[PDB]
Design a protein around this ligand. Structure first.
Ligand SMILES: OC[C@H]1O[C@H](O)[C@H](O)[C@@H](O)[C@@H]1O
Length: 463
């Protein structure tokens, strides 16, 4: 039970974050419309993204051979998913089974102090990033005695960024997202260059006996892994969703041949959606402070690289002068801390006080811990609601041609590391799909980004 001047603030600011069922429907409609415009735009100029024609990049994956579940072998993969970089080793057993061995390192915290924060810096060169990839592949390879010999090892590469892929072995970086600016201020950029080559050169510098044989977006990797692990009689995987540091999805487009595609699976790049976004003033501020102003706008509303900060800025606006100096500090509250508050089962809300004291140095009153709950609910629900609409809209585009039972695989910290979020996304998704809700099967695909690169390396072997 709370002061009235506070509650008026609570009611006002949560209302900027509400999403009614009618508007969410318009979203699904606007999304589906934007999808066809992307397909038609791709038919006209398949090699070029003309953004005024469509916010979606609708990029060809060059994948036409879906996994059969029988792909066999052991392959290395490198999973470049964003702020963290993860190197993997995976063996395939010939049935839908995967053993996986993984080592997650960080790009922000390289161990240097130049370049402000990270290998993301405009002043970091391209060569450093790809060398660091080879450096960690070297270490994982030496550990397994696979490295020392002189016969070349093939490697799958998931590059979680919008790329133009003229082939499965060719991928040109279009635009950095998720806060990266690597090479933009140097003579050695990543943007506009073949990432397959840049990596193969990183192998060459370190004498590593490896070669990248495929480059794929992390969303498509999730789909590939699901298809491989697809049980007999279990419907096929036609959608891959990543809901994590960034937010994006791939899907199976039946008209792939018609609209001049080489693969069947399209990387939508829906993070860059810009039509009728239900923005709040904090959303304008977040975009303004970004390194990619006016791009990835939808992602800046719903992605996990951004939820904690949205909560914080809303938090400051509601409690007003009761906030500690650290409450005003940018990026004091990450999205993981929001997961704790939403998924708190302690009695005295003990766990929720800890994240508040840990981030802000405030022994939260019972009043203020109530506020942190509601502000976390209002923000996170907006992400889940729009995310469900996104899935449904993708489902509607497929079902327009192909209506049946099929499954959609979901990956990323926001979905597998947050029970509350996973509940809301599925709840909203059940509402939008209406009667057909039973037709879409949501299945978690943990580490689909990393497995899928390896499975793709296998399918190349199979031809
Ligand atoms: O990390 C998941 C998503 O985040 C960003 O939007 C990337 O541009 C996109 O390629 C990726 O699929």
């Amino acid at each position: 039970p709370i002061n009235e001047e506070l509650s008026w603030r609570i009611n006002k600011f949560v209302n900027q974050l509400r999403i009614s069922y009618s508007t969410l429907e318009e979203f699904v409609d606007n999304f589906v419309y934007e999808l066809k415009k992307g397909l038609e735009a791709h038919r006209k100029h398949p090699n070029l993204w003309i953004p005024h024609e469509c916010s979606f990049k609708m990029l060809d994956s060059c994948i036409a051979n879906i996994p059969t579940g029988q792909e066999k072998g052991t392959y290395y993969a490198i999973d470049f998913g964003g702020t963290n970089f993860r190197a993997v080793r995976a063996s395939l057993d010939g049935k839908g089974k995967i053993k996986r061995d993984q080592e997650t390192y960080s790009l922000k915290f390289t161990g240097s102090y130049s370049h402000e924060k990270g290998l993301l810096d405009k002043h970091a060169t391209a060569s450093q990033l790809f060398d660091h990839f080879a450096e960690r592949i070297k270490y994982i390879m030496g550990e397994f005695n696979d490295l020392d010999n002189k016969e070349v090892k093939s490697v799958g590469f998931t590059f979680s960024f919008p790329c133009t892929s003229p082939s499965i072995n060719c991928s040109i970086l279009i635009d950095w997202t998720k806060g990266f600016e690597t090479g933009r201020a140097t003579n050695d950029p990543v943007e506009g260059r073949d990432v397959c080559k840049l990596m193969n050169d990183a192998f060459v510098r370190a004498a590593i006996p490896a070669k990248v044989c495929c480059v794929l977006n992390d969303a498509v990797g999730t789909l590939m892994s699901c298809a491989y692990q697809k049980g007999r009689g279990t419907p096929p995987c036609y959608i891959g969703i990543i809901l994590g540091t960034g937010s994006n999805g791939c899907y199976y487009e039946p008209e792939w041949k018609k609209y001049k595609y080489a693969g069947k699976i399209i990387n939508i790049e829906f993070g860059n959606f810009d039509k009728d976004l239900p923005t709040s003033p904090i959303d304008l501020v977040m975009d303004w402070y970004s390194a990619n102003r006016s791009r990835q706008l939808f992602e800046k509303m719903i992605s996990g690289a951004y939820l904690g900060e949205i909560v914080r800025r809303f938090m400051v606006n509601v409690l007003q002068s009761a906030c500690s100096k650290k409450m005003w500090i940018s990026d004091s509250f990450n999205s993981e801390s929001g997961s704790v508050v939403l998924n708190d089962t302690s009695k005295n809300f003990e766990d929720s006080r800890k994240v508040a004291k840990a981030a802000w140095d405030m022994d939260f009153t019972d009043e203020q811990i109530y506020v942190l709950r509601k502000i976390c609910e209002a923000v996170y629900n907006r992400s889940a609601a729009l995310a469900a609409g996104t899935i449904a809209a993708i489902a509607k585009r497929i079902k327009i041609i192909e209506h049946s039972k099929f499954t959609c695989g979901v990956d990323g910290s926001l979905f597998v590391k947050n029970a509350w979020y996973c509940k809301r996304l599925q709840e909203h998704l059940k509402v939008i799909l209406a009667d057909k809700a039973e037709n879409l099967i949501i299945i978690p695909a943990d580490d689909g980004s990393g497995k899928g690169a390896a499975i793709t390396a296998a399918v190349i072997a199979l031809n």
